[PDB]
């Protein structure tokens, strides 16, 4: 006898660090290009954007490769393309660091609510991050998906036989973690770490600055769902 | 995530799993084309070559299966084979091979749709495949067979533990599951290992397996396996 029954959690940049490592890869990529191009010139013009193979580490590497070949008019040396491959390989072999307060927060939540990890990305690398994280033991239901759109979240909830009104999703993206869930009648917790359509006065949302606030926020949303 | 199958009385097998690549649709043809285009690029450097297995075997452990990792392993192999002589323009060409493979035409194999529909009349059906989730999802949509495969399960590896996990979610014991595929090693052997049944259809002994040369034989094979299963349980 309670309103919210299930709490979902994003992976990358919610449960564990990810973007930091992609920023390191990007820094290394630009260092390679700086041997060929004047990158201190508002004039380049990437457009890594255009070459997205995907947004995961494999897609990033192929995109970095195409970009480098394009921007250097195919003058880039094979030895330096090998260095871009080593960036992706290094990014793929990154043990993920769990975000401080996350294990405590999930444990506290898992004491009163069912939980599910819903992560979009490369299946292989995401399974590796889940394993590396040590968080498997708190998540008996784990979903890796190719897209976070309303229908994918709906499909997930349909497998739990649970209406969206009894679900809270926690994530670092208003666009891909909160908005789609609101769209099907759910609740969100946003912990920031792609314009989105979330209304400035959205009542079914809390912004929680760090994971230590997630349990209180779930309970707050649960009381609201009970009154509403 | 799979959800428990409604099991029917009066039959023993309840669920039939299908592989995709080289079972429901053509795949290997396109990978062989990829490999011949790769060799054609290399031919301008060297008098394929099989430094490629070396590289792919070590990269499996970071990429898993699929065309994206294949492309990166090809780049790495070409740079090795040509002692870093390979032109960026030709590496460009390797990336295009990979791009082409990632959108390869999905041509369903003769007789498959009728076989699947026939089986689906009496049994739950699931598509179980390893590799790239996004690419495998796109192949089922390109194929035209989406209406028959609402249940779709992409895994990182096809091994007994994985198959057992999939079945645990359907809440089904392995003796009520048949798996159909073209690879003995990946499709059939791991399912036999956890106590299931197998149909082996290679893409051009063992009482719980049938070797069936083409898909038109699959529905009869399922029925025969079901009959055997029922006499034992
Ligand atoms: Cl990717
Ligand atoms: Cl990913
Ligand atoms: Cl694949
Ligand atoms: Mg995230
Ligand atoms: Mg196959």
Q: How far apart are CA A83 and CA A29, in angstroms?
A: 8
For residues B19 and B75, state if they share a domain.
no
Any alpha helices (H) in chain B, and if so which ranges? Answer: 28-42, 52-63, 67-81, 88-102, 112-120, 133-143, 160-170, 189-193, 218-232
CA dihedral sign, ordered A15, A16, A22, A24: positive
B213 three-class SS? coil
Q: For residue B41, which of B89, B90, B96 has the smallest C-alpha distance?
A: B90
Q: How far apart are CA A168 and CA A157, in angstroms?
A: 11
DSSP state of B45: T
Spatial contact of A142 and A186, defined as CB atoms under 8 Å apart: no
Q: For residue B169, which of A150, A4, A9, A143 has the smallest C-alpha distance?
A: A143
Alpha carbon of residue A10 to chain centroid: 6
Looking up tokens 């059906």, which residue turns up? B125
B142 three-class SS? helix
For residues B79 and B178, state if they share a domain.
no
CATH number at residue A199: 3.40.50.1000
Q: How far apart are CA B88 and CA A81, in angstroms?
A: 8
Determine the angle formed by the axes of helices B88-102 and B28-42, rounding to 10 degrees.
Answer: 170
Spatial contact of A127 and A149, defined as CB atoms under 8 Å apart: no
Q: How far apart are CA A117 and CA B132, in angstroms?
A: 19
Distance, in angstroms, between B6 CA and closest chain A CA?
14
Question: Is residue B118 packed enough to be buried (19+ CB in 10 Å), middle (13-18) or exposed (0-12)?
Answer: middle
For residues A101 and A211, state if they share a domain.
yes
Spatial contact of B107 and B25, defined as CB atoms under 8 Å apart: yes
Binding residues of A for Mg(2+): 10, 12, 172
Chain A contact present for B6, CB below 8 A: no
Distance, in angstroms, between B75 CA and closest chain A CA?
8
HSE of A101, CA atoms in CB hemisphere, 13 A: 11
For residues A78 and A139, state if they share a domain.
no
Of A69, A77, A79, the CB nearest to B92: A69
Q: How far apart are CA A43 and CA A116, in angstroms?
A: 45
Phi and psi at B133, nearest 5°, equal -55, -50
Q: Any idea what the Cα angle at residue B105 is, between residues B100 and B109, rounded to 5°?
A: 140
Chain B contact present for A103, CB below 8 A: no
| Domain-terminating residue out of A95, A122, A139 | A95
DSSP state of B187: I
Look at B88 and A78 and tell me if their CB atoms are within 8 Å. yes
Spatial contact of A33 and A71, defined as CB atoms under 8 Å apart: yes
- Chain A residues touching B64 at Cβ < 8 A: 123-124
- Per the annotation, does B182 bind a ligand? yes
Q: Count CB neighbours of B195 within 10 A.
A: 15
For residues B15 and B62, state if they share a domain.
no
Token digits for B159? 């091994």
Q: How far apart are CA A53 and CA B65, in angstroms?
A: 15
CATH number at residue B101: 1.10.150.240
For residues A53 and A13, state if they share a domain.
no
For residues B136 and B194, state if they share a domain.
yes
Q: How far apart are CA A114 and CA A100, in angstroms?
A: 21
Please indicate the experimental technique that yielded this structure.
X-ray
Spatial contact of B17 and B177, defined as CB atoms under 8 Å apart: yes
Look at A78 and B98 and tell me if their CB atoms are within 8 Å. no
Look at B132 and A123 and tell me if their CB atoms are within 8 Å. yes
Spatial contact of B155 and B128, defined as CB atoms under 8 Å apart: yes
Look at B68 and A54 and tell me if their CB atoms are within 8 Å. yes
Q: How many distinct structural domains can be found in chain A? A: 2
Q: For residue B212, which of B197, B191, B229 has the smallest C-alpha distance?
A: B197
For residues A91 and A65, state if they share a domain.
yes
B25 three-class SS? strand
| Domain-terminating residue out of A46, A62, A95 | A95
Q: What is the DSSP string of A107-166?
A: HHHHTTSEEEEEEES-HHHHHHHHHHHTGGGG-S-EEEES--SHHHHHHHHHHTT--GGG
Of A75, A79, A143, the CB nearest to B1: A143
Distance, in angstroms, between A59 CA and closest chain B CA?
8
Of A59, A76, A85, the CB nearest to B68: A59
B193 three-class SS? helix
The last residues before gaps in chain B (C-N over 2.5 Å) are 47, 204
- Write the CA distances from A80 to A42, A58, B59, B162, integer angstroms: 24, 17, 19, 39
Distant-in-sequence, close-in-space partners of B13: CB < 8 Å, separation ≥ 6: B123, B176, B177, B178, B197, B222, B225, B226, B229
Spatial contact of A144 and A126, defined as CB atoms under 8 Å apart: yes
Look at B68 and A81 and tell me if their CB atoms are within 8 Å. no
| Domain-terminating residue out of B105, B137, B153 | B105
Name the residue in chain B with its Cα closest to that of A59: B68
For residues B14 and B110, state if they share a domain.
yes
Q: How far apart are CA B115 and CA B220, in angstroms?
A: 9
Chain B contact present for A202, CB below 8 A: no
Token digits for B170? 């359907």
Spatial contact of A184 and A150, defined as CB atoms under 8 Å apart: yes
For chain B, give the number of residues.
Answer: 233
The domain of B112 spans 1-27+106-232
Q: For residue A121, which of A65, A182, A59, A181 has the smallest C-alpha distance?
A: A59
Binding residues of A: 10, 12, 172
For residues B77 and B121, state if they share a domain.
no
For residues A70 and A180, state if they share a domain.
no
What spacing in Å lies between the alpha carbon of B136 and ligand 3's midpoint?
6
For residues A160 and A120, state if they share a domain.
yes
Q: What is the DSSP string of chain A?
A: --S--EEEE--BTTTB--HHHHHHHHHHHHHHHTTTS--SSTT----TTTT---SSHHHHHHHHHHHHHHHTTT-S-HHHHHHHHHHHHHHHT-PPPBPTTHHHHHHHHHTTSEEEEEEES-HHHHHHHHHHHTGGGG-S-EEEES--SHHHHHHHHHHTT--GGGEEEEES-IIIIIHHHHHTT-EEEE---------TT-TTEEE-SSGGGHHHHHHHHHHHHHH-
CA dihedral sign, ordered A141, A147, A149, A152: negative
Q: How far apart are CA A97 and CA B27, in angstroms?
A: 38
């Amino acid at each position: 006898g309670q309103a919210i029954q299930l709490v979902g959690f994003d992976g990358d940049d919610t449960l564990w660090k990810s973007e930091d490592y992609y920023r390191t890869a990007e820094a290394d990529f630009e260092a390679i290009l700086s041997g060929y191009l004047d990158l201190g010139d508002s004039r380049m013009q990437q457009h890594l954007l255009a070459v997205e193979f995907g947004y995961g580490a494999k897609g990033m590497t192929l995109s970095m490769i195409e970009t480098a070949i394009e921007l250097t008019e195919a003058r880039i040396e094979a030895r330096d393309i090998q260095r871009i491959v080593e960036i992706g390989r290094a990014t793929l072999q990154h043990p993920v660091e769990v975000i401080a307060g996350v294990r405590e927060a999930v444990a506290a939540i898992a004491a009163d609510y069912a939980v599910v990890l819903i992560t979009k990305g490369d299946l292989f690398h995401q399974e590796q991050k889940i394993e590396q994280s040590g968080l498997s033991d708190l998540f008996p239901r784990i979903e890796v998906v190719s897209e976070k759109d309303p229908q994918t979240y709906a499909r997930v909830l349909s497998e739990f036989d649970l209406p969206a009104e009894r679900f809270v999703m926690i994530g670092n993206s208003l666009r891909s973690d909160v908005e789609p869930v609101l769209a099907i009648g759910g609740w969100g917790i946003y912990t920031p770490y792609q314009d989105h359509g979330v209304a400035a006065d959205e009542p079914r949302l809390r912004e929680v600055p760090d994971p230590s606030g997630w349990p209180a926020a779930v309970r707050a949303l649960d009381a609201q769902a009970g009154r509403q």
